[PDB]
Amino acid sequence: RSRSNSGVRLDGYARLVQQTILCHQNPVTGLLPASYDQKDAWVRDNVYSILAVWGLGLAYRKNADRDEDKAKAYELEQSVVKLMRGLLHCMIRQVDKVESFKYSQSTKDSLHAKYNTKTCATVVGDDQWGHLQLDATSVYLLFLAQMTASGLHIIHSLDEVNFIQNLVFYIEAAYKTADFGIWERGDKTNQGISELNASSVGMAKAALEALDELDLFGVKGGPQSVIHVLADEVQHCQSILNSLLPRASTSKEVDASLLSVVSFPAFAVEDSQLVELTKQEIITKLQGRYGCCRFLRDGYKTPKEDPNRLYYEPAELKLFENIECEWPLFWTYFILDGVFSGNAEQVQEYKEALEAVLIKGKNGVPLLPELYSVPPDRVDEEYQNPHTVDRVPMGKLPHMWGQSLYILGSLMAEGFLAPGEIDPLNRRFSTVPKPDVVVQVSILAETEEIKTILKDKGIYVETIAEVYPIRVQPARILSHIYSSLGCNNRMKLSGRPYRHMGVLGTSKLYDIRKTIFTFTPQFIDQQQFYLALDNKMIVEMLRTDLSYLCSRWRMTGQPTITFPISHSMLDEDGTSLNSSILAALRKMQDGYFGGARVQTGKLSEFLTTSCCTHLSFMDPEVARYLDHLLAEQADILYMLYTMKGPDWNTELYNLLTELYGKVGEIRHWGLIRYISGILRKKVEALDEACTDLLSHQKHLTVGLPPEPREKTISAPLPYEALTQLIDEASEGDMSISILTQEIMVYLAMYMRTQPGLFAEMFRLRIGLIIQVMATELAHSLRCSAEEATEGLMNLSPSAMKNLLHHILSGKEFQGQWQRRRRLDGALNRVPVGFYQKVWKVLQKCHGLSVEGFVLPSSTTREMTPGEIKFSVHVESVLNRVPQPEYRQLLVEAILVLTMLADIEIHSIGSIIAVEKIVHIANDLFLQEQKTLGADDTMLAKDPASGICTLLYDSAPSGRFGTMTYLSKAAATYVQEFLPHSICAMQ
Amino acid sequence: SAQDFYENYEPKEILGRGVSSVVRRCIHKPTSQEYAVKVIDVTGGGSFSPEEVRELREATLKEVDILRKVSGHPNIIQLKDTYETNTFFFLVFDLMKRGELFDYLTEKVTLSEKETRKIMRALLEVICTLHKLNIVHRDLKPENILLDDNMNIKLTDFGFSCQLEPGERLREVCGTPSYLAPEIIECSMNEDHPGYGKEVDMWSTGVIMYTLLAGSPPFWHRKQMLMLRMIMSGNYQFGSPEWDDYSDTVKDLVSRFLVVQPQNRYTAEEALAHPFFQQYLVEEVRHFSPRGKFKVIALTVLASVRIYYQYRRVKPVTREIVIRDPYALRPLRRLIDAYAFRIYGHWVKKGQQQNRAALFENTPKAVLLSL
Numbered sequence A: 001r002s003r004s005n006s007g008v009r010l011d012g013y014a015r016l017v018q019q020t021i022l023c024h025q026n027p028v029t030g031l032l033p034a035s036y037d038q039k040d041a042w043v044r045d046n047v048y049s050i051l052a053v054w055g056l057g058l059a060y061r062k063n064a065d066r067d068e069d070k071a072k073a074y075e076l077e078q079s080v081v082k083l084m085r086g087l088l089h090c091m092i093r094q095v096d097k098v099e100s101f102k103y104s105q106s107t108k109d110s111l112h113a114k115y116n117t118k119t120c121a122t123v124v125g126d127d128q129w130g131h132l133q134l135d136a137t138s139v140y141l142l143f144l145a146q147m148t149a150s151g152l153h154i155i156h157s158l159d160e161v162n163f164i165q166n167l168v169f170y171i172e173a174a175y176k177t178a179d180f181g182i183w184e185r186g187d188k189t190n191q192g193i194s195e196l197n198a199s200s201v202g203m204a205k206a207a208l209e210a211l212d213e214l215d216l217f218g219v220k221g222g223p224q225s226v227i228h229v230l231a232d233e234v235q236h237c238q239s240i241l242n243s244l245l246p247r248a249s250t251s252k253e254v255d256a257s258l259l260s261v262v263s264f265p266a267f268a269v270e271d272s273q274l275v276e277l278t279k280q281e282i283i284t285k286l287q288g289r290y291g292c293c294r295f296l297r298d299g300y301k302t303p304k305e306d307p308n309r310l311y312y313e314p315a316e317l318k319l320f321e322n323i324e325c326e327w328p329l330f331w332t333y334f335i336l337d338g339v340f341s342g343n344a345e346q347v348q349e350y351k352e353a354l355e356a357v358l359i360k361g362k363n364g365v366p367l368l369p370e371l372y373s374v375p376p377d378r379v380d381e382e383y384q385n386p387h388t389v390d391r392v393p394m395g396k397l398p399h400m401w402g403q404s405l406y407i408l409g410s411l412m413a414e415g416f417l418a419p420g421e422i423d424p425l426n427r428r429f430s431t432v433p434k435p436d437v438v439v440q441v442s443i444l445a446e447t448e449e450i451k452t453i454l455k456d457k458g459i460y461v462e463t464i465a466e467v468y469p470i471r472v473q474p475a476r477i478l479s480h481i482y483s484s485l486g487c488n489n490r491m492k493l494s495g496r497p498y499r500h501m502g503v504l505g506t507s508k509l510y511d512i513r514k515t516i517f518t519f520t521p522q523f524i525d526q527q528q529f530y531l532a533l534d535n536k537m538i539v540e541m542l543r544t545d546l547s548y549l550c551s552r553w554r555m556t557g558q559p560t561i562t563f564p565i566s567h568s569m570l571d572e573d574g575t576s577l578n579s580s581i582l583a584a585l586r587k588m589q590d591g592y593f594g595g596a597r598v599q600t601g602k603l604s605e606f607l608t609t610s611c612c613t614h615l616s617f618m619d620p621e622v623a624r625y626l627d628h629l630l631a632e633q634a635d636i637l638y639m640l641y642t643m644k645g646p647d648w649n650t651e652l653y654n655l656l657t658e659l660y661g662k663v664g665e666i667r668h669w670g671l672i673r674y675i676s677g678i679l680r681k682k683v684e685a686l687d688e689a690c691t692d693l694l695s696h697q698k699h700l701t702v703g704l705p706p707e708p709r710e711k712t713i714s715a716p717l718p719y720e721a722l723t724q725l726i727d728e729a730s731e732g733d734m735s736i737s738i739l740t741q742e743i744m745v746y747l748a749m750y751m752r753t754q755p756g757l758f759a760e761m762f763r764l765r766i767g768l769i770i771q772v773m774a775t776e777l778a779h780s781l782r783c784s785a786e787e788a789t790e791g792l793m794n795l796s797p798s799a800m801k802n803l804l805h806h807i808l809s810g811k812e813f814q815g816q817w818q819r820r821r822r823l824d825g826a827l828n829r830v831p832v833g834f835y836q837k838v839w840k841v842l843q844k845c846h847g848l849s850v851e852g853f854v855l856p857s858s859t860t861r862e863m864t865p866g867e868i869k870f871s872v873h874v875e876s877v878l879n880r881v882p883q884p885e886y887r888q889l890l891v892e893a894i895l896v897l898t899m900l901a902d903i904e905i906h907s908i909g910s911i912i913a914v915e916k917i918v919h920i921a922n923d924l925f926l927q928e929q930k931t932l933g934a935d936d937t938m939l940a941k942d943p944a945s946g947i948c949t950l951l952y953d954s955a956p957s958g959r960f961g962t963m964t965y966l967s968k969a970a971a972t973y974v975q976e977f978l979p980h981s982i983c984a985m986q
Numbered sequence B: 001s002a003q004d005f006y007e008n009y010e011p012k013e014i015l016g017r018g019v020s021s022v023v024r025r026c027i028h029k030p031t032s033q034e035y036a037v038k039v040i041d042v043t044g045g046g047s048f049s050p051e052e053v054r055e056l057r058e059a060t061l062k063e064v065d066i067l068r069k070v071s072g073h074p075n076i077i078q079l080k081d082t083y084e085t086n087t088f089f090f091l092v093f094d095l096m097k098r099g100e101l102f103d104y105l106t107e108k109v110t111l112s113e114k115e116t117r118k119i120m121r122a123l124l125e126v127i128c129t130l131h132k133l134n135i136v137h138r139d140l141k142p143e144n145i146l147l148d149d150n151m152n153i154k155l156t157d158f159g160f161s162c163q164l165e166p167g168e169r170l171r172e173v174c175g176t177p178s179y180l181a182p183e184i185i186e187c188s189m190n191e192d193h194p195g196y197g198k199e200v201d202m203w204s205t206g207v208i209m210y211t212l213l214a215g216s217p218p219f220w221h222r223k224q225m226l227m228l229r230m231i232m233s234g235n236y237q238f239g240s241p242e243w244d245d246y247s248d249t250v251k252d253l254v255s256r257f258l259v260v261q262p263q264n265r266y267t268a269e270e271a272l273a274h275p276f277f278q279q280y281l282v283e284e285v286r287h288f289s290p291r292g293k294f295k296v297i298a299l300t301v302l303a304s305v306r307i308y309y310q311y312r313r314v315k316p317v318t319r320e321i322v323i324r325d326p327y328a329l330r331p332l333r334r335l336i337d338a339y340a341f342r343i344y345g346h347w348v349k350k351g352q353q354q355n356r357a358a359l360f361e362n363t364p365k366a367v368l369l370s371l
Ligand SMILES: C/C=C(\C)CC/C=C(\C)CCC=C(C)C
Pocket: A841, A844, A845, A897, A898, A900, A901, A902, A903, A904, A906, A907, A908, A970, A971, A973, A974, A975, A978, A981, A982, A983, A984, B317, B318, B319, B322
């Protein structure tokens, strides 16, 4: 008869939400201003700030049996619809930016982070603010999918369905797009430098999964209202999340916003060890007694920053250490994580901790402070003793973002809401183990005459024609097809951009206009590049591509890879299958290949046990093609074909792809590469290839050693610009341009499968990689560098990949160690933590000088030991020596100071010339061998360095090793600079 | 069949690699227990001809046999079950979270006397079991030795093993060059020598002693045949400054396995009886003549006095001794070796051109370039 006590207590929560959040909702737009001082509505904050209203509305709807508690449930539900619709109008008024960002992932074409709360218009310009925040649109897209799944009808028209579909392509490239992120400041420096933040990558993955086959019209919807998401981009975000975490970016060791990725609302991390490790990293490095710092060296409202300058100078970062403002917002995330994980202890430690920071206001309602700031006088005390001084609440009061999750956490912790109701798409189960899937493979024959060669080897296949009505197509065709998904001419939306399709996309069965479609996997495409013309590379790519499939399939049915055997995959004779592919095919019949369970069969058998995705946008360019589809010496010719002029690409005739045809059949790699350079054939996955290397805390440098011509990649570059940078860094030589990108695939190939070869290289310098690969193939089969240069063009992709792995793994086919020091200092290979060891030494010194270029101790305070920017500073000083072998002598010379530094209690207190320590070590290496019987002939000087050639060839350790002489000369230099020394601890 | 493989185990991650065999970690679904699976490609990517395809199977079929002949023993892995397909041969065994002894010997260049004692105590006690069952290994390299989280030795890759018929001595050359006993090469260079028996394993084990305690093989040089003459002739040296800090009980036991003549070699049963592997059992009466008591009390004094004297002798690290001779004294030499293997620990691998001795230069350049 009376209202349930749940309804009564929700009234207190209704008052809390109304008095704190819903009283600021704009009457016209439904948007929420950040505060009275900041009268604008942020896309990310508004979505987060509406969660309390959405949770309250769901909580009130649980007992909707009376008129009033139906109505307040309706108000809260439709207030959420008002905000999410109001935020839709803000973004839908910038469809030109969404369309432009899909193709060019630039900051200048990004959806604005803040809008007019009164008119849904852009308050600020495209350059007056840090606008590219892919975790703000994704927080909208994720919850839009979740709120529709909960029953909230937000999307009203099929044009908005197209807009949201086009918004998927907007957030698809989050794994390869740098953005300012959750804190609108980009990197840690706050200098307008966009970076690949795990929050943006994680948020897009969850939003993409949330929108995956989601009907925006609810249950009363159709295929026209379904948002189609490609798992290639979803799992590409995973490859970045796994590589980035527990770090938030290359510049941030950790961010408390990763709590928005590991647990709520993203659930974007599938490995529970990563979730716990990242959450505990936040615990140690960020949490104190007033919340959690956003990220180390934040200084957003620290009293040691001027509130007038929008940017921070590099030296100011060290001023923020240990006195950073602390935000209780992240403690609401830990409460929310505990409710989802089911850790009542966690929901208690962070609830009492948050209840002691909540500032009471108005009629006793709790207000969540935006941040707790150190008083200006007490900054020095927290410098010395961390996280103990009393902080004052500053910033926004209330923080409408954090306040909502506090109420949302309060609602779900007192039994007014369940994790499933706030997460109807079941993202909370992302951490549960997933068994590996059985990859179905249907080997096909392009012609009948290939079916007989396979039959003679005992391979049961159907021909390309026997599979009809099921018809196979290249992976490109599938990419063209999705270019019609989300097309709206009046809204000027052009659908999905052309993106390369991996196996996760091409292993599905496609239902286009009632005709079942299977698409050949992209790594067999031969028109794009020459990686499909090496049959030993088909197996290697196939081996990893099945391994990628089995461990990363998240769709109904089993993946189906249709593998067509082509004439190129046969032998040079033409009557026998190539042994590498021959082994690969029988490998699949036995049921195991590349770590994946392969159930070989015919494409007809796998019709019912595959992911049959209906491509409803094709249901009544590419459609026209599909409509008909449904119904003397060779080497000389290039000298001719390049002296036609620069490639005119027109008909000045009297089509090198035809000339590229025979060389693919004869498989002469030097010639075929040259055609790819002069035709500018370019791989379709270099931008994930670069990003994967980039996401593992590496800087990619492509180009020959000199700095102005060698360009560094530190931020994820889009496909066009990254390729343009490679071509411009190709200084016109087309052979290096392809080898640059060709090695880039192999570097990413080994990085994904064997991460341990790059643990000693923090900067991937592709440009010298061709050089260092040239020297070993020059010393092997001893020949000139030019012959090696012609030789390097000539190896097969598998041989090229093996030889690069021969370089990286440390396997050996002047002198032995001279070849192990020209291969150790030319790749800038340094031991693990050496950049973390220079920091310790420089604190005991004034600097480290190499060839009279100093690396001062001021750098130690300026960047952290683990900062990759510091790694650049130590690295930049170490390339002041041109010759590679001498650099490694400097490298281990640096460490003999490190090991002597630990023994020595006192500090040198002056400059140390790392170069000189080698020189007298060269001089002292000279004297001992003279005394023991060395002739002047054996001790011959290196012409440029000044080191004996035998010293280069000398082993590291031993009585007469290089680091015994350098552990010897690292003491006479300390004699003059340090008159008195004390060595302890042995 | 492969179905039988996946009905009981699920391979998660790649643990190691080989020439044609891949080691992969798996989860046993019925037991949820960690287990290692070695995945040998029988066809070997098509490089293997039908003879090698057949021979690898027969080598693998034999390989199950020895690992089926020895079971339940603490320090060799248990082949839990073996699955054979037309293209692979799966072998599931125990999971060793840590890698081979080679990887460990790379991390710690010189392996301490206490640690090596239990290491080989197992290995010699491993060797006893093989010889008592009359099975020789011929392959006792540290990469063949696997260690677990408690450092326990798990001898692995009995791929070259073969059971001698009672009183029969082999002739085939099986094994990477450094760890080959002198008569292995001699039988390779002559037909009169009628073969080698189970005493082969003794030499290979004694080689680990020089490698573990010094970080280098007893005989190593960059060309192939030159190493061989150091082996058959048997010229080894506990060189200075490296090998002088170890106790004298170490040296004699090293020579015992390293004697070039097989019959005088130190077989496994008496190998564990050398003073190094003697253990202090608390409950021993240990009765002694009055002269025996007088020694003990004198030796108990002689010990205490000794320990004070030895310690007093250790020279603290000073500036000058670093200038004159770093390697000469232990604490700085072990350090130089340690930071030697942190920079170029990737340069040590399996084979002859990648052994650990390449990282040590113990001889003048002139003598090295004498010939
Ligand atoms: C115990 C060291 C004895 C000779 C070598 C001299 C040591 C040093 C000269 C200074 C180098 C590093 C310092 C880190 C603080």
